[PDB]
Amino acid sequence: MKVEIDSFSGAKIYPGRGTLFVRGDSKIFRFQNSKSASLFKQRKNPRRIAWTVLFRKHHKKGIT
Amino acid sequence: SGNGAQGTKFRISLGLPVGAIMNCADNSGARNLYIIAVKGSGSRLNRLPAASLGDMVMATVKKGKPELRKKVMPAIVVRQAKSWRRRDGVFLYFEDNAGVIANPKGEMKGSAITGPVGKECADLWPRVASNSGVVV
Amino acid sequence: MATRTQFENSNEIGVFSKLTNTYCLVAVGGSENFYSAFEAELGDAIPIVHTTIAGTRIIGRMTAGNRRGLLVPTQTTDQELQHLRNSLPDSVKIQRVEERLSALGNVICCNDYVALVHPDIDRETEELISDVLGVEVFRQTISGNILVGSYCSLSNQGGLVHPQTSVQDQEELSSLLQVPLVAGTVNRGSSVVGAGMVVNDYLAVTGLDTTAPELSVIESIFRLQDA
Amino acid sequence: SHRKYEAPRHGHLGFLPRKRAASIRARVKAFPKDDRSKPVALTSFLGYKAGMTTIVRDLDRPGSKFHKREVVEAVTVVDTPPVVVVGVVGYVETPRGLRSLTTVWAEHLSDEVKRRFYKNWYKSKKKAFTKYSAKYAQDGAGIERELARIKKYASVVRVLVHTQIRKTPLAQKKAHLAEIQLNGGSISEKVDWAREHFEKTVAVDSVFEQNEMIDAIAVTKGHGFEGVTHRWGTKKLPRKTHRGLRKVACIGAWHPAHVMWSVARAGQRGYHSRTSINHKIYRVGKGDDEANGATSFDRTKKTITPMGGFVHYGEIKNDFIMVKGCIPGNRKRIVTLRKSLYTNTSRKALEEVSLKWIDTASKFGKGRFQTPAEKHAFMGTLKKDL
RNA sequence: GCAGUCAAGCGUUCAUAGCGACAUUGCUUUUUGAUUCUUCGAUGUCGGCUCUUCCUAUCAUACCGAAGCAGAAUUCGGUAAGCGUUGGAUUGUUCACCCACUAAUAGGGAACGUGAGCUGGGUUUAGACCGUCGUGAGACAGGUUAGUUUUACCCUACUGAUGAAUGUUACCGCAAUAGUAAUUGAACUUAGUACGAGAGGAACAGUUCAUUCGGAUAAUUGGUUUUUGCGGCUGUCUGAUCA
């Protein structure tokens, strides 16, 4: 039982939760849920969505 | 199944009814395939036979070298884009439908396959695994 | 010293097994009349490890290695990985690799002193492949095909290629490998050479339907019949 | 003429009629065959259905491709406050079928069980069993009179039991009553075993064990009066139809000129008595414990109640049978778990299961976190908190 | 259109493995007819769609008997209607014939089942065009195009839902009668074994998956969104910020 990270929203992914996505160059994308899987299909940038991990990582939130 | 199928396959979600048109991912020279039937399918009034990843079908070449056209030949589904469920728990799907072109015994008319290949395909058809790059 | 073996009904032995000077690896399905075919010629000398790679029965397809080490794809579970580290010797070093191209069997062909890799594999891993497999790396294509590991079957003595290969292509690429190369077919005329047989110095196994002229060719170039 | 293309029926003729089930508690129509060499024990057990959740486990099933790898699976949690025995009843075989000759009740009955005898509890003087509890006012020669009529007679002995509804998040307060036959030997030893347990309590692990294959008996979720298409699964008619496209078009031939019981019609759907069989038990849970929902590899102490509790149910503070698959009836219904009626091999049965993980994340949303110790771990402190 | 009886004869010889000519004896109401018994103070006419059920004259599956059956394969018969029998291109088409799958893609009945169930492509009004025919109005072994598809609330039947009288009232049951379901295929093994000069090449048992059907159920994935739940955006109005 391995726990992976959602590559868009950063959440941990427990078994049987979410979907996986294999793009044309075969790079694999995992998603915690339909929300982050829908924002990925809209071409939204992860680093400008305020609640994602990579967002807070650039804005330097909570690492203090 | 029948000729060429090694072992059994675990049912996955059917993504390609009769009439579907998928990319043909091999280098054999066909640009796309047109599924006219699915090998081994069941018979119920009004259903359309429906393919899935790793299946063997009957296809024709709409776009591609005219040598290959106007003739029905068997084909194999290497990609789906209708998300199915593995038993390790994941749902996954590819970016689009795709397939390769084969003989009733399962050998490959082409020498390569581009982009990913589902590992429900790669295990069930030993020649497809030998031609594959990325396997999922 | 060739051997005819049929996994289930399959004639492709390079799919299901990965055979090196140090160790052997075989598929976990079907009858051990397949598995006994390795031991009877091998004996008690080398290990033989039943395994699944990424859950798939295709181990030599997803793995590339020589006696000095093994490379395993990322989709390999860790519940499987440790099993491969204990059953092999501690001399063999497995180092897992994350790459765009998942099946490492087709992408790489290597014998102890030489490797040939698919040209599109990243410059990071050709560094690593030098370390784990302990070889020199050369990016080539055998007769304009793509996957080298499936279509060119090597061993320290000599190596084989698919029949479609040009003669200027064979003589070109033999100087790279240092070993005599021979075109041919296997499994009653299958174009795919590296998926139809596995071979090392003292053993070669191939599908039951290979023809007697073909078998001698395999026997001759791999120096099977001694000597 | 003839059908012109010959296709299977719509709907199973064995489950008719589809009328409403006649109680919220589903009957048990038959019990396992009696083995007189075993100790005396009950053939079924009552419980309440909490919810479902997710299970990882290693599949060891020789020859399969998924052999020795984790697989996610759905389980249903049925909740168990221990059952308690208020009486016993004998039955004598007659040429018209089994018949109960006598009934014998416990001395002291709880509020809950006496409440079952009352539509109006608040207006009641609560006088049930008052004259009966005075048949112990003697040495008991009137009740031991009757237990002697059971032993002599009574091919089979069933034991009236009742649920404890006050350990359950349900609001009911009125406990469910039921009979359970006992398969231990010697009908003389059956009424002994009963008489010794009156007003005592019985627990899960003394009936069902690990890995067993049991029946689940509930009344179906009611969906109400329903039309032919979604009830019987018919084709929807073409767009162009007049007077509705969701129907069955031909209701019969000219002759016989009547509609036949086998054509599809609209009516009650859901809320029926349904027995499903061969459900492997992944856990038999402890009432007072921590790490009900941990396991040998897991090691973090947490119960099986999800974050925020099971939706529409409660917290699972009692014993529970945790059974693979899905089960008739919906949440908060009374389930009756029966022992199997036949021996099994099947190699899927007889497989021993070890649960590698259990899903305690919330069912009221998309749960990102298993334990609140996990949530505060990742999410950090908030504006309330510290 | 279907089933027997005699076997003149085809078949290496061999009437009955497999047939039958000459003819004779029957069955069939899914052929076409003949008659004109009921209906013209109207039984709504083709086909498809939808859906149920029965027959057996068995296409597949089950178990059997036979061969001029080594195996493999196929063929003929036996009990047998339990369960199945399909997706399409062309055509209004029933029929048919082609493509591909299938274990198989059998034949029929029920007012040529079924329009207060649909549809309205066909025939078959009134409009119009052509070809032949007629002096003409007009006619058609014809071709073509456009053309209103009504009603249930009644009685039964069916499907679901209550219910008086069984001294009152509650709980736990029994089980008469009725209905009843699963299905079929392939892969690994057995085993490259048996049979066989060879070419080729099985099966009982066991095992992993699958097709059609059925019953549930909603942890996960998906769909749905009047939680108008939260955010975004447009035009305009409340004097603007805000709401």
UniProtKB/Swiss-Prot annotation, chain A:
The keyword Ribonucleoprotein applies. It comes from Saccharomyces cerevisiae (strain ATCC 204508 / S288c) (Baker's yeast). Keywords: Cytoplasm, Phosphoprotein, Ribonucleoprotein, Ribosomal protein. It is found in: Cytoplasm. Component of the large ribosomal subunit (LSU). Mature yeast ribosomes consist of a small (40S) and a large (60S) subunit. The 40S small subunit contains 1 molecule of ribosomal RNA (18S rRNA) and 33 different proteins (encoded by 57 genes). The large 60S subunit contains 3 rRNA molecules (25S, 5.8S and 5S rRNA) and 46 different proteins (encoded by 81 genes). Belongs to the eukaryotic ribosomal protein eL24 family. This is Large ribosomal subunit protein eL24A. The gene is RPL24A. GO terms for molecular function: mRNA binding; RNA binding; structural constituent of ribosome. One of its GO terms (cellular component) is cytosol. It comes from the Eukaryota. The modification Phosphoserine is found at residue 7.
Curated annotation (Swiss-Prot), chain B:
The keyword DNA-binding does not apply. Keywords: Acetylation, Cytoplasm, Methylation, Ribonucleoprotein, Ribosomal protein. GO terms for biological process: cytoplasmic translation. It is found in: Cytoplasm. The modification N-acetylserine is found at residue 1. The modification N6,N6-dimethyllysine is found at residues 105, 109. GO terms for cellular component: cytosol; cytosolic large ribosomal subunit. Its main location: cytoplasm. SMART domains: Ribosomal_L14. GO terms for molecular function: large ribosomal subunit rRNA binding; structural constituent of ribosome. Methylated by RKM1 at 2 different sites, but it is unclear which are the 2 methylated residues among Lys-39, Lys-105 and/or Lys-109. SUPFAM superfamilies: Ribosomal protein L14 (SSF50193). It holds the Pfam family Ribosomal_L14. Component of the ribosome, a large ribonucleoprotein complex responsible for the synthesis of proteins in the cell. The small ribosomal subunit (SSU) binds messenger RNAs (mRNAs) and translates the encoded message by selecting cognate aminoacyl-transfer RNA (tRNA) molecules. The large subunit (LSU) contains the ribosomal catalytic site termed the peptidyl transferase center (PTC), which catalyzes the formation of peptide bonds, thereby polymerizing the amino acids delivered by tRNAs into a polypeptide chain. PANTHER family: 50S/60S RIBOSOMAL PROTEIN L14/L23, LARGE RIBOSOMAL SUBUNIT PROTEIN UL14. Belongs to the universal ribosomal protein uL14 family. HAMAP family: Ribosomal_uL14. There are 2 genes for uL14 in yeast. This is Large ribosomal subunit protein uL14A. It comes from Saccharomyces cerevisiae (strain ATCC 204508 / S288c) (Baker's yeast). The gene is RPL23A.
Swiss-Prot record, chain C:
CDD domains: IF6. GO terms for molecular function: ribosomal large subunit binding; translation initiation factor activity. It comes from the Eukaryota. Keywords: Cytoplasm, Initiation factor, Nucleus, Phosphoprotein, Protein biosynthesis, Ribosome biogenesis. Coiled coil: none annotated. It is found in: Cytoplasm; Nucleus, Nucleolus. InterPro entries: eIF6 (IPR002769). GO terms for cellular component: cytoplasm; cytosol; nucleolus; nucleus; preribosome, large subunit precursor. SMART domains: eIF6. Phosphorylation at Ser-174 and Ser-175 promotes nuclear export. It holds the Pfam family eIF-6. GO terms for biological process: assembly of large subunit precursor of preribosome; cytosolic ribosome assembly; maturation of 5.8S rRNA; maturation of 5.8S rRNA from tricistronic rRNA transcript (SSU-rRNA, 5.8S rRNA, LSU-rRNA); maturation of LSU-rRNA; maturation of LSU-rRNA from tricistronic rRNA transcript (SSU-rRNA, 5.8S rRNA, LSU-rRNA); ribosomal large subunit biogenesis; ribosomal subunit export from nucleus. The modification Phosphoserine is found at residues 174-175. Transmembrane segments: none annotated. Present with 18600 molecules/cell in log phase SD medium. Monomer. Associates with the 60S ribosomal subunit. Belongs to the eIF-6 family. This is Eukaryotic translation initiation factor 6. It comes from Saccharomyces cerevisiae (strain ATCC 204508 / S288c). The gene is TIF6.
Curated annotation (Swiss-Prot), chain D:
It is found in: Cytoplasm. Transmembrane segments: none annotated. The gene is RPL3. GO terms for biological process: cytoplasmic translation; maintenance of translational fidelity; ribosomal large subunit assembly; rRNA processing; translation; translational elongation. Changing residue 242 to A: Cells accumulate 35S and 23S pre-rRNA precursors. Cells display defects in translation elongation resulting in decreased translational accuracy. This is Large ribosomal subunit protein uL3. PANTHER family: 60S RIBOSOMAL PROTEIN L3-RELATED (PTHR11363), LARGE RIBOSOMAL SUBUNIT PROTEIN UL3 (PTHR11363:SF5). Component of the large ribosomal subunit (LSU). Mature yeast ribosomes consist of a small (40S) and a large (60S) subunit. The 40S small subunit contains 1 molecule of ribosomal RNA (18S rRNA) and 33 different proteins (encoded by 57 genes). The large 60S subunit contains 3 rRNA molecules (25S, 5.8S and 5S rRNA) and 46 different proteins (encoded by 81 genes). uL3 forms together with ES39L one of the contact sites for the signal recognition particle that targets ribosomes to the endoplasmic reticulum membrane. One of its GO terms (molecular function) is structural constituent of ribosome.
